[PDB]
Amino acid sequence: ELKNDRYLRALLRQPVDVTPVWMMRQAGRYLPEYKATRAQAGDFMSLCKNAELACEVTLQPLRRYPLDAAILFSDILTVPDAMGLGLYFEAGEGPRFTSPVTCKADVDKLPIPDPEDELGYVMNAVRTIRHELKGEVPLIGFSGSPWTLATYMVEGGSSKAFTVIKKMMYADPQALHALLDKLAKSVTLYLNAQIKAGAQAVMIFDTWGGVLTGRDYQQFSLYYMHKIVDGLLRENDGRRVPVTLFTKGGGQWLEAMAETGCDALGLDWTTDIADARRRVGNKVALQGNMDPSMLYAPPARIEEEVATILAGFGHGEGHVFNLGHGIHQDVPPEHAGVFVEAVHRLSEQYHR
Amino acid sequence: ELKNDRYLRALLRQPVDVTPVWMMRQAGRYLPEYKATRAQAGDFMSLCKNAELACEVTLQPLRRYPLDAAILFSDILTVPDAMGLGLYFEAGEGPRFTSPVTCKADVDKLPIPDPEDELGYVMNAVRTIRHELKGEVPLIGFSGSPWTLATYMVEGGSSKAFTVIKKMMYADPQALHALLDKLAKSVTLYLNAQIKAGAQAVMIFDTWGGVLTGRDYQQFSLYYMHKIVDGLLRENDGRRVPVTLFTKGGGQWLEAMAETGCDALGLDWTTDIADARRRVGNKVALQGNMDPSMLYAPPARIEEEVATILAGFGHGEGHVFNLGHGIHQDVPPEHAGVFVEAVHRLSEQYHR
């Protein structure tokens, strides 16, 4: 039985006593105990496949900072990895693919993985984490969006210019669509399995959508995330399960996204909170906005950025505080704790 | 004596018969003859220091596509290289620095290079190119903005998260300012020397400004580019010399930039041309907007993107067509030629 409501209420723009908080990549190297467990797993790849350890790292943050929500520890490339492509995580270079989807054949041959079957290990963690959280807080299930995933699947990893997907997009659009569509069906099944296995909320990372035109962003990215939402079950375990979409950088596309069906939209320090709320506030809840590097600042300074960001939004009800990007390994542990306390202490005035 | 006016007129929002065109990084590997001359120089570093060869590559594009303007071949890291920091161009990794500016000492010890003296080689190319262009087209002089330069000088090269400058920014702002200010003085001297040595126009690349807050973007980036403009000589050789500022991604900051003093603002496919013009059009001229990857498309398709982009703007007078980012080596030569002809042929209707 769940005790903390905040997160779930805020995403639904429902009154809360204080604003909720959670940090992207709260299960990361900035935590000494995290770096340890990761060494028990061997490589990141296996860490993400081990249910006991995957959970443990998801729990480490909650034992330091009373965060209103936890996000299963997994990888965005979970689905593409289960599509027979040769994916490895070089602790130096980066996520790489030996057989990147090139043309149409590559796409038609691409298979839809059974979440419970081939991706049944991320489902295991969900089950574990839920039983572990012992009702203390809601569990967030996640996945990349059809497009940013197709990026790595075509680029073969992380590209600095995405020179390939676009050569495809602008010269073989039917192919990119064949692909993106399959990826839509896939992740929809993928996300529902999480929801069924315990996920009480869910979020889609379209981390690269902002590298596109407003035309192409909508053609090849929004449409597909939208489909997921039209096909996700908004309810389970007697509760409405929330959905948050997040295109880093796409602060201007903010208007179209709201038409998505989705309950919440994520933001990054590139978009003004007030601005965003003034443009979609009464339509969708908003998630975080701070700059992760700000966590390097002295406690006092950080606190005033929580206060700054809390204003610009403030007055209402639909807000979940958060960073615009995951935490960087070098950030000090008690510095995040300062941040997590600033949002609670200083946001309570905007709910009275 | 100059014959082509287009570029210079358009930036000044003055009537032209057709819209002008020029591509960022038109002196690049996509040109077979470019890859050759680069091999004559040895490494990129020396290619940028050799006046004869630097010019030659700047001229290669004009012998294939009748572009309304040419940009001296040089590097943004010209100034930081002349500041005693240890900079090398690894054809694999990237621009690296052995002694990155770390704290205040690093900044106070940092020297202002005499353009004609220590950077007198980029001035040589200017003189050469101008005499080479034999009046056919105006020469653009360029440099990075104080901030994006301070990026490489602090990060030591290209960072994917700029994790360091920001740790500085948010924890040692006086230091980052000490730095940025010096960099402002520097580049101002740097750019004037180009203007004096033949540059008929000039442009500042703040390629990383968009990775910042709107608050910080203005504090640590705009202010400093602005200073340059307040200190650049808008006239020389009987002509008003134009100034173009360009923050890739900062399409939303578009309003503040116009208050800069600058004549033209650059854009990337992330910002809608029509939108931009509707927001600053009657205040500043705009430069390009297309996606470089679009050049992979079939001629017919490219042409319609020139036509699309020409609309959204169209009707007026203050526009210079361009890409939102340099050309990628793999783009076919006659494909750019198609693009360069589409802007001339199809833009002439918007000036009648």
Coordinates of C-alpha atoms in Angstrom, one line a residue, chain A residues 160-164 166-167 170-171 210-216 248-249 252-253 269-272 291 293-298 301 305 308 325 328 330, chain B residues 160-164 166-167 170-171 210-216 248-249 252-253 269-272 291 293-298 301 305 308 325 328 330:
Chain A
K160 CA 27.4 14.4 -32.2
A161 CA 25.6 15.4 -35.4
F162 CA 23.2 12.5 -36.1
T163 CA 24.5 12.7 -39.6
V164 CA 23.0 9.3 -40.5
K166 CA 18.8 12.4 -41.1
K167 CA 20.4 11.2 -44.3
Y170 CA 15.5 13.2 -45.7
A171 CA 16.2 10.5 -48.3
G210 CA 15.4 18.9 -29.9
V211 CA 18.0 18.4 -32.7
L212 CA 15.1 18.5 -35.1
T213 CA 13.1 21.0 -37.1
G214 CA 9.7 21.9 -35.7
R215 CA 8.2 20.2 -38.7
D216 CA 10.3 17.1 -38.4
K248 CA 15.6 18.0 -23.7
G249 CA 15.9 21.3 -25.5
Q252 CA 9.7 25.8 -27.9
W253 CA 7.8 22.7 -29.1
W269 CA 17.3 25.2 -17.7
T270 CA 16.9 26.4 -21.3
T271 CA 13.2 27.1 -20.9
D272 CA 11.8 29.6 -18.4
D291 CA 20.9 23.0 -14.1
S293 CA 26.0 22.0 -12.5
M294 CA 24.3 24.3 -10.0
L295 CA 24.8 21.5 -7.5
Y296 CA 28.5 22.4 -7.4
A297 CA 27.6 25.8 -5.9
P298 CA 27.7 26.4 -2.1
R301 CA 23.5 29.4 -3.5
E305 CA 17.9 28.5 -7.2
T308 CA 14.0 31.2 -7.7
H325 CA 19.7 16.5 -16.7
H328 CA 27.3 14.4 -12.8
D330 CA 31.6 14.8 -9.1
Chain B
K160 CA 29.7 17.2 -23.8
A161 CA 28.3 18.6 -20.6
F162 CA 30.5 21.7 -20.0
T163 CA 30.7 20.3 -16.4
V164 CA 33.7 22.5 -15.6
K166 CA 29.8 25.9 -14.9
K167 CA 31.4 24.6 -11.7
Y170 CA 28.2 28.8 -10.2
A171 CA 31.0 28.7 -7.7
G210 CA 22.5 27.8 -25.9
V211 CA 23.7 25.4 -23.2
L212 CA 22.9 28.1 -20.7
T213 CA 20.0 29.5 -18.7
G214 CA 18.4 32.6 -20.1
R215 CA 19.7 34.4 -17.0
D216 CA 23.2 33.1 -17.4
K248 CA 23.4 27.9 -32.2
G249 CA 20.2 26.8 -30.3
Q252 CA 14.4 31.8 -27.9
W253 CA 17.0 34.3 -26.6
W269 CA 16.7 24.7 -38.2
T270 CA 15.5 24.7 -34.5
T271 CA 13.9 28.1 -34.9
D272 CA 11.2 29.0 -37.3
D291 CA 19.6 21.7 -41.8
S293 CA 21.7 17.0 -43.5
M294 CA 19.1 18.1 -45.9
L295 CA 21.9 18.3 -48.5
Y296 CA 21.8 14.5 -48.6
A297 CA 18.3 14.6 -50.1
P298 CA 17.7 14.4 -53.8
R301 CA 13.8 17.8 -52.4
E305 CA 13.4 23.4 -48.6
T308 CA 10.0 26.5 -48.0
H325 CA 25.6 24.4 -39.2
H328 CA 29.5 17.4 -43.3
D330 CA 29.9 13.2 -47.0

